[PDB]
Amino acid sequence: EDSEVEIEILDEPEQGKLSMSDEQKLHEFAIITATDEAFAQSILQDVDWDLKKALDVFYGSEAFAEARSAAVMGEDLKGFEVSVMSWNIDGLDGRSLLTRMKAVAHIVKNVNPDILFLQEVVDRDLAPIDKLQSLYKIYYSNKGCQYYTAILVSKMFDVEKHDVIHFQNSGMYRTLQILEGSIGGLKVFLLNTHLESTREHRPQRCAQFGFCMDKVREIIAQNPGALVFFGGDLNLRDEEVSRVPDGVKDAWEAAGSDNKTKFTWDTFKNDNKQGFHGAKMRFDRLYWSGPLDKVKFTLEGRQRIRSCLCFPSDHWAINATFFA
Amino acid sequence: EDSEVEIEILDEPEQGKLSMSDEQKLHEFAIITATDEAFAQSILQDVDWDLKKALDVFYGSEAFAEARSAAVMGEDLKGFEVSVMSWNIDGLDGRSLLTRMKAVAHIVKNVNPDILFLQEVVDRDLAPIDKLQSLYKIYYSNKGCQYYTAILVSKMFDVEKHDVIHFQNSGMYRTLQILEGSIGGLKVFLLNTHLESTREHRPQRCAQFGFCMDKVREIIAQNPGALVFFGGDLNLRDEEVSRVPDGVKDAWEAAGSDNKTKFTWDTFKNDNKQGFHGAKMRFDRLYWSGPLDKVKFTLEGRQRIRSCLCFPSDHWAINATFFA
């Protein structure tokens, strides 16, 4: 009654056709979609061989956008490398703070990363870290606080935005520090954080982690082709790690999960802190997304300082190099 | 052996706990996630009551980003309206072309839309349409062609980009015309198209439609908060309409699916073209996404021109007004 009425074609067969076999489906799908039978064969064998929903999938499903683009319409990064370093420098440890901070600056200069994430930075004896400003642009998350985080980037790195999100469920002043910029024509996002500490704060830490991954997921959706780096001292236990978004990988895992570079906080090997029993964790991690698919991963800051016989920090630094 | 070793807490109960009932799950989920039992109750009743995957869902699932944001962290458009008009003006009909084009410009001036999509524009007798440049910024898809599409926007509309994608599976010069801009602080995307004509070209038309919806989906993902308008002469039969992306709606349907405004090409009522039997279709449609949720929908150009006794076009124009 209020249904559409189709245009008559005078020399067209005057009956619409009307079950079938599997090869009939192959052919039918091919004729209807104007695609070949080999492509038909791909779709229909991921469902019972239901022609009706095979059509809906070809036209409507998000998985087949490439196929639709091919049906309708029919890199510069080789030789490019970028290194990211992350280090909880334990500024809250007053013992040999100045000497340790000098060692930190020395180690940073030797490793020479393009991008450096720092956690537990304090105002006291910050001078040698501030000296890095000759080589880096320095962004402090929350200056005026007992302790905070920093992002240092090479002078070639153009910065557009610096945002700091304060976790409201944190009793430890923890934040998400976000730096948006670019290296040449390539857009880059940096997300540095120090998640809630200690096993008992698992609820806070796990909520924070998932929130951070939500932010990463938003950045990726809004910036195709961009490089995204998220990490820092995440204080994670392996079983705490929730689902990471599509296209995001753990740098240490993508480098081959080397046992020799696994633990970043290790009291068996680092005696800056001492318990009755040794403990060890992969607290410091780095995640990335973007048009670089290969990665090398090493630990740094593992040499005992000779003047005072301690390590720069109770953490090892992680150093990841991404390339294509 | 290469497993992590947890920090000892001297005054902590020295045994990890270890099946349970439904209220135990409620409590457990509440303690673990540091959320209440009422919120726990929501998740667990969308799965068997599997605590393990209830946790994974809370932390990892994309559906619960708002919940995570609330756990970690804890409009201007009222009074704003925008009208979009779309009209296949049938420039390929030489009969009374100049008079009909004058009527088109007259009708456009009376309706006074902010945004106008035109299809089947030809160079011949284009003068009255070009006269609209005093009121509109005019963008032609493919000038130099037998026929093409246009987008006209109010002078207040700032334009950043004009792109035209030529459908390679089209034997009728069909394109996707994309205008990116803004009205005030509000970003706006316009997608105008004339999909492959005739029932027989269903394969081409349906592929084009899904491709266009892919583009809409990309724009939405990359531009949260933006207004997106996609439509034109889509030549669609109801059964041809594939899945539209999330947050996208048909303007005529959202206006209440009025039978009095359904058909846009109706030979029972429009005699610019004559068959032995009447035909009628909702060929012209408008889809939108963005921060406006209400819509009014009317048909325009339904008056017979008095000097030559024909309608401006064999199509009715569609006119949608979006507001909050």
Side-chain angles (χ1 to χ4, degrees), chain B residues 195-221:
Chain B
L195 298 190
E196 215 77 5
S197 313
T198 73
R199 211 192 78 240
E200 212 286 343
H201 292 97
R202 180 173 178 173
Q204 290 77 49
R205 172 170 59 259
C206 287
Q208 290 164 4
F209 184 79
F211 174 80
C212 292
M213 283 304 179
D214 291 334
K215 265 43 209 171
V216 168
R217 204 182 59 246
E218 292 184 354
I219 292 173
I220 294 170

Side-chain angles (χ1 to χ4, degrees), chain B residues 48-297:
Chain B
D48 205 335
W49 288 58
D50 196 328
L51 174 59
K52 175 55 177 53
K53 68 181 76 146
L55 272 347
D56 301 342
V57 156
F58 175 68
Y59 293 120
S61 175
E62 192 183 345
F64 285 83
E66 294 292 87
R68 289 188 294 275
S69 178
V72 174
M73 298 304 301
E75 52 107 355
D76 222 332
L77 266 49
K78 249 53 177 180
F80 174 77
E81 289 192 352
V82 60
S83 49
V84 183
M85 190 181 171
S86 186
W87 207 354
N88 182 333
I89 63 179
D90 195 16
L92 288 173
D93 182 8
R95 297 168 314 166
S96 304
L97 186 56
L98 181 55
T99 299
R100 287 175 34 233
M101 294 306 94
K102 288 181 178 177
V104 166
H106 181 84
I107 289 168
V108 167
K109 288 190 272 190
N110 298 335
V111 174
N112 191 28
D114 308 316
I115 298 159
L116 171 67
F117 288 0
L118 297 179
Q119 304 85 37
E120 283 191 37
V121 187
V122 297
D123 300 343
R124 178 190 157 195
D125 290 324
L126 184 55
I129 302 304
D130 275 326
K131 255 70 167 295
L132 295 178
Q133 77 179 16
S134 62
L135 298 164
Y136 295 92
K137 297 175 176 189
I138 307 184
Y139 296 83
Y140 298 119
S141 70
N142 190 18
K143 266 222 155 190
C145 193
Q146 180 180 39
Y147 62 104
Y148 45 91
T149 66
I151 296 182
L152 291 74
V153 298
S154 168
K155 294 292 182 66
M156 73 175 172
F157 190 102
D158 279 314
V159 178
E160 305 306 322
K161 285 182 54 195
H162 182 228
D163 289 328
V164 180
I165 301 177
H166 301 254
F167 300 148
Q168 294 306 308
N169 71 339
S170 178
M172 301 177 192
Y173 318 108
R174 309 306 175 78
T175 63
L176 178 56
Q177 184 181 22
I178 305 175
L179 207 63
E180 169 186 336
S182 62
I183 300 171
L186 173 66
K187 202 132 194 62
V188 179
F189 291 76
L190 305 177
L191 290 80
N192 181 19
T193 192
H194 186 185
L195 298 190
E196 215 77 5
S197 313
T198 73
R199 211 192 78 240
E200 212 286 343
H201 292 97
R202 180 173 178 173
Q204 290 77 49
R205 172 170 59 259
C206 287
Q208 290 164 4
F209 184 79
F211 174 80
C212 292
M213 283 304 179
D214 291 334
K215 265 43 209 171
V216 168
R217 204 182 59 246
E218 292 184 354
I219 292 173
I220 294 170
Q222 298 171 38
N223 305 275
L227 253 181
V228 192
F229 294 111
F230 163 67
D233 188 356
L234 309 188
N235 276 307
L236 286 171
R237 281 73 178 167
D238 279 343
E239 60 185 341
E240 295 172 338
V241 175
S242 51
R243 191 181 332 176
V244 319
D246 304 338
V248 170
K249 288 178 167 184
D250 186 315
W252 173 76
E253 298 184 346
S257 296
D258 200 331
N259 283 325
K260 296 174 293 292
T261 59
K262 188 175 183 181
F263 302 105
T264 64
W265 189 84
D266 187 349
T267 66
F268 288 100
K269 285 286 179 293
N270 189 315
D271 53 22
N272 276 29
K273 301 200 184 182
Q274 305 167 263
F276 185 68
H277 288 155
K280 61 177 175 178
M281 287 281 174
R282 190 160 73 90
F283 276 164
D284 308 274
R285 313 187 180 197
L286 204 56
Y287 301 85
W288 98 102
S289 175
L292 299 183
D293 54 333
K294 299 173 176 62
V295 55
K296 294 192 174 69
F297 188 99

Side-chain angles (χ1 to χ4, degrees), chain A residues 1-9 12 31-34 56-62 64-65 68-69 71-74 165-169 199 202-204 206-208 210-211 214-215 217 221-224 236-239 242-243 259 262-263 265 268 276-283 285, chain B residues 1-9 12 31-34 56-62 64-65 68-69 71-74 165-169 199 202-204 206-208 210-211 214-215 217 221-224 236-239 242-243 259 262-263 265 268 276-283 285:
Chain A
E1 67 293 346
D2 285 281
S3 303
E4 62 194 39
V5 181
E6 186 57 81
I7 292 86
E8 288 177 354
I9 299 166
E12 158 171 55
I31 296 294
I32 294 173
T33 62
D56 301 342
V57 156
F58 175 68
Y59 293 120
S61 175
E62 192 183 345
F64 285 83
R68 289 188 294 275
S69 178
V72 174
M73 298 304 301
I165 301 177
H166 301 254
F167 300 148
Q168 294 306 308
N169 71 339
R199 211 192 78 240
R202 180 173 178 173
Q204 290 77 49
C206 287
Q208 290 164 4
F211 174 80
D214 291 334
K215 265 43 209 171
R217 204 182 59 246
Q222 298 171 38
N223 305 275
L236 286 171
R237 281 73 178 167
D238 279 343
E239 60 185 341
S242 51
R243 191 181 332 176
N259 283 325
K262 188 175 183 181
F263 302 105
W265 189 84
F268 288 100
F276 185 68
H277 288 155
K280 61 177 175 178
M281 287 281 174
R282 190 160 73 90
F283 276 164
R285 313 187 180 197
Chain B
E1 67 293 346
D2 285 281
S3 303
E4 62 194 39
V5 181
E6 186 57 81
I7 292 86
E8 288 177 354
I9 299 166
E12 158 171 55
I31 296 294
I32 294 173
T33 62
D56 301 342
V57 156
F58 175 68
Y59 293 120
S61 175
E62 192 183 345
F64 285 83
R68 289 188 294 275
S69 178
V72 174
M73 298 304 301
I165 301 177
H166 301 254
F167 300 148
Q168 294 306 308
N169 71 339
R199 211 192 78 240
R202 180 173 178 173
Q204 290 77 49
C206 287
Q208 290 164 4
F211 174 80
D214 291 334
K215 265 43 209 171
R217 204 182 59 246
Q222 298 171 38
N223 305 275
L236 286 171
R237 281 73 178 167
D238 279 343
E239 60 185 341
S242 51
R243 191 181 332 176
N259 283 325
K262 188 175 183 181
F263 302 105
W265 189 84
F268 288 100
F276 185 68
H277 288 155
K280 61 177 175 178
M281 287 281 174
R282 190 160 73 90
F283 276 164
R285 313 187 180 197

